[PDB]
Design a protein around this nucleic acid. Structure first.
Ligand SMILES: [Zn+2]
Ligand SMILES: [Zn+2]
Ligand SMILES: [Zn+2]
Ligand SMILES: [Zn+2]
Lengths: 46, 45, 65, 49, 234, 33, 56, 79
RNA sequence: GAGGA
């Protein structure tokens, strides 16, 4: 799916507004990752 | 009943985090230089 | 980490020889002198590249996510 | 052409130290100044002179 | 601060702090040349204020409260700090009032009984004092937080806690004697979840741990068993 | 019985979670062996 | 010296107050501005002097 | 054609060859990613160009990367 | 702390 955050511990998916900041709802963790973009980043082979 | 744990807690923590071996009120009279920040530049370092 | 391609100085591709090198060691019990020479790494500019590699990417592969 | 002198030659372990130059290059052409003494600020990270 | 040349009343300017100048982004004239970087006991009536500060600080220590809660309570005390509507009130009632003020404002759930176990306030003069103090601060100018505290105090896992969370969320919409002092409702939701589970924390331990009635729990449980219909997520 | 203070723990000291754990766990803890 | 240094001037009775620029106020947070060290010392001298006048 | 000579906006089939790569750690053991996994996408116009050279006797070329389980790698390249 | 030289 499209993504907004990842639980660090459970390594699943998630989405949140400016609501809670925590709680991998399953593990209830307190650290989330920012769910890598989709900008199709460009790279230079050198 | 009414024992200030924060005394020991914060005292230990502050001392470690700065390394001024002494008292939190001891600024310079406390011996300093202990408790550095674990150079992790290269495993052997 | 993973094998480098292309022995730095020499330029010869070596990024493919890694598997076979390991195989020689395990299954053939071969001696890495002769192992290298078997893969054709004649000059030490490449022999260095293989012999001394360190395959950390293994130990990276063990963190679950 | 061949060289008239032969060359010592072999592998050798070399370790790359930190402080690449890009962290030393530094140039100031009238940037910001301190508060107390109104001389240029200090530290290249702070645009110092 | 305006561009003499370009002369637009709201001046579209830029600060080239790296050069330490200020520029009329329109015409390019520099406006200001050197930009100063800045980035790095009885004679004062604060005697009572600092006595309150010290007692507040030691109380915050005892409660293990966050520095933000400590600051909020200190600020609330400073906001009142004197009034006829206060009129004394033992100087401990106001401490407890401002402490609960700080905790609520920083979103910390704290029981009047816990606060009173910290401070002898007689709890009734405390009620009046907190009322007047809240009103004063309202002039001078959300109950879910209690669950995980007790979940921890009873040693309960996070999925149990979120089950309780959803139960309490539906509690508001399930009048049919929903709350009426919803601390009882929180504790009975906890009891619902543990009874849904197989946890040997039978009512005695929870009651003696949370200083709650052994009977109000089953009083709530009576309607809770009927209410069981709207509580099954998975 | 009575709480007092809070002691920082040297890592892998007898009292640390890691003190006895094995490799695979260490990995699972995201902690380099 | 007669004109510039008479010994009684070696003991202060009036006190000059160096203006702000000598002791500027660092605004190291953006709502409040930590005052210069000297300014605290001046507050202290002023406090004590006030007190002595009171006690007299 | 050298890209600096092709007028197309940065690449075309007269000045480039597009490769692509997808890998996924379906297995439980480590999934190697070899050069041979590269796949041409752009049209070669029948020019003997761009097949990754495979001197390896085992048939899979350079070892590009290793994948554990859920790790997925998917990118496209221009030659 | 760091610290190069
Ligand atoms: Zn999680
Ligand atoms: Zn070579
Ligand atoms: Zn202008
Ligand atoms: Zn083209």
């Amino acid at each position: 799916a499209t993504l907004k955050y990842i639980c660090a511990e459970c390594s699943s998916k998630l989405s949140l507004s400016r609501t809670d900041a925590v709680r991998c709802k399953d593990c209830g963790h307190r650290i989330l990752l920012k769910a890598r973009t989709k900008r199709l980043v460009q790279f230079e082979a050198r | 009943l009414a024992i200030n744990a924060k005394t020991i807690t914060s005292g230990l923590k502050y001392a470690l985090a700065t390394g001024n071996w002494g008292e939190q009120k001891k600024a310079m009279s406390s011996r300093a230089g202990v408790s550095q920040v674990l150079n992790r530049y290269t495993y052997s370092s | 980490m993973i094998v480098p391609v292309r022995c730095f100085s020499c330029g010869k591709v070596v990024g493919d020889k890694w598997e076979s090198y390991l195989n020689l060691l395990q299954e053939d019990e071969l001696d890495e002198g002769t192992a290298l020479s078997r893969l054709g790494l004649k000059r030490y500019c490449c022999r260095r590249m293989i012999l001394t590699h360190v395959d950390l990417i293994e130990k990276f592969l063990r963190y679950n996510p | 052409k061949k060289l008239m002198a032969q060359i010592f030659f072999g592998p050798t372990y070399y370790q790359r130290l930190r402080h690449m130059v890009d962290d030393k290059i530094h140039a100031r052409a009238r940037g910001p100044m301190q508060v107390l003494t109104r001389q240029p600020v200090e530290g290249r990270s702070r645009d110092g002179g | 601060l305006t561009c003499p040349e370009c002369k637009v009343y709201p001046p579209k300017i830029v600060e080239r702090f790296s050069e330490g100048d200020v520029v009329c982004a329109l015409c390019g004239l520099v406006l200001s040349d050197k930009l100063v970087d800045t980035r790095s006991v009885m004679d004062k009536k604060d005697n009572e204020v600092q006595a309150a500060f010290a007692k507040i600080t030691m109380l915050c220590d005892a409660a293990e409260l966050p520095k933000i809660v400590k600051d909020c309570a200190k600020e609330a005390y400073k906001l009142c700090h004197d009034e006829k509507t206060l009129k004394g009130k033992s100087m401990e009632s106001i401490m407890a009032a401002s402490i609960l003020i700080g905790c609520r404002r920083a979103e910390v759930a704290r029981t009047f009984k816990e606060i009173q176990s910290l401070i002898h306030v007689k709890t009734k003069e405390f009620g009046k004092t907190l009322n007047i103090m809240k009103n004063i601060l309202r002039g001078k100018s959300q109950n879910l937080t209690y669950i995980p505290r007790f979940c921890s105090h009873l040693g309960l896992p996070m999925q149990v806690t979120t089950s309780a969370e959803y139960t309490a969320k539906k509690c508001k919409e399930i009048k049919e004697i929903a709350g009426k002092s919803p601390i009882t409702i929180a504790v009975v939701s906890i009891y619902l979840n543990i009874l849904l589970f197989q946890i040997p924390i039978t009512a005695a331990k929870v009651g003696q741990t949370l200083q709650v009635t052994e009977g109000t729990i089953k009083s709530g449980y009576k309607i809770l068993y009927e209410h069981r219909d709207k509580l099954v997520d998975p | 019985k009575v709480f007092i203070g809070r002691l920082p723990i040297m890592l892998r000291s007898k009292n640390c979670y890691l003190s006895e754990a094995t490799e695979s766990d260490l990995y699972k803890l995201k902690e380099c062996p | 010296n007669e004109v510039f240094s008479r010994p009684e001037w070696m003991i202060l009775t009036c006190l000059p107050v160096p203006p702000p620029p000598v002791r500027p106020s660092i605004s190291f947070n953006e709502s409040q501005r930590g005052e210069d060290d000297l300014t605290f010392k001046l507050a202290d001298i002023l406090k004590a002097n006030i007190s002595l006048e009171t006690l007299e | 054609e050298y890209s600096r000579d092709c007028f197309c906006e940065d690449h075309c089939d007269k000045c480039s060859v597009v490769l692509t790569l997808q890998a996924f750690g379906e297995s439980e053991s480590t999934t190697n990613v070899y050069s041979k996994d590269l796949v041409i996408v752009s049209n070669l116009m029948g020019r003997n160009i761009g097949h990754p050279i495979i001197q390896d006797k085992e048939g899979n070329g350079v070892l590009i990367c290793k994948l554990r389980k859920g790790q997925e790698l998917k990118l496209t390249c221009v030659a």
